[PDB]
RNA sequence: GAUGCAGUGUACCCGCGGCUAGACGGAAAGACCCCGUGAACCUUUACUGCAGCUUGACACUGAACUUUGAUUGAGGUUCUAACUCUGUCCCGUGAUCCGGGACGAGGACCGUGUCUGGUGGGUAGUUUGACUGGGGCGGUCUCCUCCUAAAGAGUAACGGAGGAGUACGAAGGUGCGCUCAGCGUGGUCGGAAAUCACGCGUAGAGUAUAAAGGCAAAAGCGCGCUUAACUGCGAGACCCACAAGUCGAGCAGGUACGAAAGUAGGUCUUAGUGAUCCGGUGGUUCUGUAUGGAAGGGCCAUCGCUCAACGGAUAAAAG
RNA sequence: AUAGCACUCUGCAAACACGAAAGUGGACGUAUAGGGUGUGAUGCCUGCCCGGUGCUGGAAGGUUAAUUGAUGGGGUUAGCGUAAGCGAAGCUCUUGAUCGAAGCCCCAGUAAACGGCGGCCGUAACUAUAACGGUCCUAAGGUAGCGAAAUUCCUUGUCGGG
RNA sequence: GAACCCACUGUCGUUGAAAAGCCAGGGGAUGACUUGUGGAUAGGGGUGAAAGGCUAAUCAAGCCUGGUGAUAGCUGGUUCUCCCCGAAAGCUAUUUAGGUAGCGCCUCGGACGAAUACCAUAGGGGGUAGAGCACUGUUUCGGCACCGAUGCAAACUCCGAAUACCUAUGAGUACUAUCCGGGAGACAGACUGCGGGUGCUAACGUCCGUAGUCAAGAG
RNA sequence: UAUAAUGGGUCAGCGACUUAUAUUCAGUAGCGAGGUUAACCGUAUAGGGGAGCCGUAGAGAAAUCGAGUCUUAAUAGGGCG
């Protein structure tokens, strides 16, 4: 017989809102197993590292800092 | 002959103004391991889903 | 083996939480401070058998 | 696997006697194989009933002596009157049935009715999973991680590789504080390797556990104090056939740590799980069949399933 | 199937069978007879094992039914209490102290009862033999007799006869 | 060894003379023998010198009439005409796999409208094709674990497209999208091209993704 | 599927989506914040019969309130309206 034959159910991770899109407060922006992206202004991080908007506005992606981390933020008006 | 109600469904569903209400499952036992959020959010009534409303109406002709 | 136990309020309200412990590492009856919604104060809860 | 399709070859029309190479010739909705939550009969230490057999209590069931226990019971010895005789003699009678009378032998036994424990393929009704390069044997059935997977999500095979059915009142919260590993030098037993001091390169260390994604404001490592491992919620969003699952700012009550701004609704995250029914425990301003109560029920919080064939056909089943 | 042989049951209103009962066969018979079971004239004969299941005989220790009902707890009110509450007696819901046989657990016998009569090492090499010696187990580890057989896979085993 | 009772071999016959026979041979034939007449045993019962044999050409439970028109997720059949639109063979679950249910896909009515699509500009995050050793593995030759040259990788990555995908504006061309209700069918697919697993870089093989055709479409 | 897969030798006649009750949705008719009778009586399709049913109000398990109700300590928030 075969010792193999097992696999886990899908998790559906990924980016849900892209740059330039309008988001109201509370929308999930990124579903990530680790902090491949970091939260900037008006963005909160959850226990499972999910990024969500804490304000109304427009999404934006950027790269900044000494370490070169990828950041995602929300710009208001 | 007169249509007969399915009493099991009648004991699970009650009519609302524009639909039906029901209780939520997973609150009978095995409660210690569950989180407080789940415990408080599974309490109370909710509405019946549209994909089930037809079956509920067919089973309960008079409610 | 972690056994289920219930922590009962000392105010007589009847309120109780539930949790588990390791009997061997914690032989003594557990005693903690927690919030009591019936009286809306913090009081001592003591271990009681989960039954 | 071709009289009937394509291309070609041959062949004037119709009988009679022979022959069986083909018309996947006729005959019987294949007996082999598989399937249907089909049937029948047979077996058993498969499940569940019943007959039969057997144990004791009560009733038919009575009377006298006598011993031993704490007015009453349990044993022994006698008796006749209930009751038994498919034993003898008389009568109905002309009869090896039956009934009545007498005698004899037994006798509170045996036997029967109700209840009750045991035994019970002798009979009776049933069950005995699915997927599978046919079926059987073997393996698998739920969850987590990687690759197949074609740079959003999702994506199959009895495809290639590993884990889970836990742990922790601290391994949780907070304030403050600190950084791994491997090397080169010299030093008591001390030596590849354990302890001390200085130096060059520098995240390979570590993160309770499998892997992946992460980790300097360290998510890694200590100390002091503590219980936010709270209660009532909840704008909004993800994922979804349903039932479910996931993240979450912010608002009230009380609380811990900070000088303060503040952080805290368990643990770096993703596995460590089980619906409904029926019952148990504690509360309860609900209901409670004439009335007042009470039983019973409802609501809130909790407990009992390796229902692993893991959306679980029964409380209960092999060949 | 059979005559022969063996085991076992049955004391007569027999065991056993039919039948719901009454009754009927067994039998107008009776242990030299009747039923069940296995084997199969006759000759020589029929080894070992009671651990398992069955059957037979013991023991009254543990366990256990109906039945019985000792206690304990609750409901309800007469009466008490400013109130909260307490509450006799009568009914009533619940608990189960004690007593309580067969069977089983236990001990012996029984195989012409159902049944069983072995492994691994050194050697045997011509497949794998307690052949023979060691040891491990078991209730025990095949006496006589026979054997490539209605039983032998290798197999058309080897040798001789025809 | 005749009658009588049987049924061991062979030919014939087998739409037969015959729903079991004829012909030539064969066995018993004073016995556990053959046979006439009249009786007894009735279906989970009977009877059986035992073959599951026989019980009216019927037997692993006879026949007849009733329950009864039993049930069959199975096979078959389903009858006049014209017009309009027009599928699927997928996901999830199932003692479930050739059944069924929710969703996806079809049709009809109502409500609503350009809120929808194609293309152009603008903003986005990738880790595949390719490529390469900076990590993890593996690999060849030299100089003293390292250094100089050299290779490879679905479960390696210092890099990294084209395409796809999500958003906002805009010209034209399309009664497009969305919501509420009535009725379904379907959940056996096949071949070809491209990217792949499996197989032998075999199969008119098998399992996925993505387009076209058949299915349901003639010339 | 020409299939060498199934069915039919031929003709005539017969042969398969029905009936009752309940419910829901569309057409059409009466009436309209109302609509409508059932059994029954009745020289009987008439006329009587208003018991009853649907609609007009929800929320909550229920007691209970009511254009509001449920939860909560909350006049906050939220669910059904
Ligand atoms: Mg409960
Ligand atoms: Mg010629
Ligand atoms: Mg001819
Ligand atoms: Mg011929
Ligand atoms: Mg033909
Ligand atoms: Mg034929
Ligand atoms: Mg057939
Ligand atoms: Mg067969
Ligand atoms: Mg039945
Ligand atoms: Mg199968
Ligand atoms: Mg196979
Ligand atoms: Mg992928
Ligand atoms: Mg992907
Ligand atoms: Mg792609
Ligand atoms: Mg049940
Ligand atoms: Mg009352
Ligand atoms: Mg399942
Ligand atoms: Mg014999
Ligand atoms: Mg002999
Ligand atoms: Mg004759
Ligand atoms: Mg004969
Ligand atoms: Mg003779
Ligand atoms: Mg009989
Ligand atoms: Mg016959
Ligand atoms: Mg039968
Ligand atoms: Mg068309
Ligand atoms: Mg298709
Ligand atoms: Mg099931
Ligand atoms: Mg089928
Ligand atoms: Mg089909
Ligand atoms: Mg490549
Ligand atoms: Mg299917
Ligand atoms: Mg399919
Ligand atoms: Mg396909
Ligand atoms: Mg194919
Ligand atoms: Mg064509
Ligand atoms: Mg064709
Ligand atoms: Mg044909
Ligand atoms: Mg067919
Ligand atoms: Mg035909
Ligand atoms: Mg005709």
From Swiss-Prot, chain A:
GO cellular component: cytosolic large ribosomal subunit
Biological processes per GO annotation: translation
SUPFAM superfamilies xref list: Ribosomal L27 protein-like
Annotated GO MF terms: structural constituent of ribosome
Domain of life: Bacteria
Protein keywords: Ribonucleoprotein, Ribosomal protein
Matching Pfam families: Ribosomal_L27 (PF01016)
Keyword Ribosomal protein recorded: yes
InterPro entries noted in UniProt: Ribosomal_bL27 (IPR001684), Ribosomal_bL27_CS (IPR018261)
Chain intervals for the UniProt region annotation (Disordered): 1-12
Family to which the UniProt record says this protein belongs: Belongs to the bacterial ribosomal protein bL27 family.
Stated name of the protein: Large ribosomal subunit protein bL27
Chain's gene name: rpmA
UniProtKB/Swiss-Prot annotation, chain B:
Alphabetically ordered keywords of this record: Ribonucleoprotein, Ribosomal protein
Molecular function GO labels: structural constituent of ribosome
The protein, known as: Large ribosomal subunit protein bL35
This protein's GO CC annotations: cytosolic large ribosomal subunit
Family matches, as InterPro entries: Ribosomal_bL35 (IPR001706), Ribosomal_bL35-like (IPR021137), Ribosomal_bL35_CS (IPR018265), Ribosomal_bL35_sf (IPR037229)
Gene3D superfamilies xref list: 4.10.410.60
Similarity comment text for this entry: Belongs to the bacterial ribosomal protein bL35 family.
Protein's GO biological process: translation
Extent of the signal sequence: none
Any matching Pfam family: Ribosomal_L35p
């Amino acid at each position: 017989s075969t010792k193999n034959g097992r696999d886990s159910n899908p998790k559906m991770l990924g980016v849900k809102v892209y740059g330039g899109q309008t988001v109201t407060a509370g929308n999930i922006i990124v579903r990530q197993r680790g902090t491949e992206f970091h939260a900037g202004a008006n963005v909160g991080m959850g226990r499972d590292h999910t990024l969500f908007a804490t304000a109304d506005g427009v999404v934006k992606f950027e790269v900044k800092g000494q370490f070169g981390r990828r950041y995602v933020k929300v710009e208001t008006v | 002959a007169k249509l007969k109600t399915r009493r099991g469904a009648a004991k699970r569903f009650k009519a609302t103004a524009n639909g039906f209400k029901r209780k939520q499952a997973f609150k009978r036992h095995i409660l210690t391991k569950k989180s407080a959020k789940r415990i408080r959010q599974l309490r109370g009534c909710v509405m019946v889903h549209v994909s089930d409303v037809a079956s509920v109406r067919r089973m309960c002709p008079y409610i | 083996m972690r056994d289920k136990i219930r922590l009962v309020s000392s105010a007589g309200t009847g309120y109780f939480y539930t949790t588990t412990k390791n009997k061997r590492t914690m032989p003594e009856k557990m005693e903690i401070k927690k919030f009591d919604p019936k009286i809306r104060q913090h009081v001592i809860f003591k271990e009681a058998k989960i039954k």
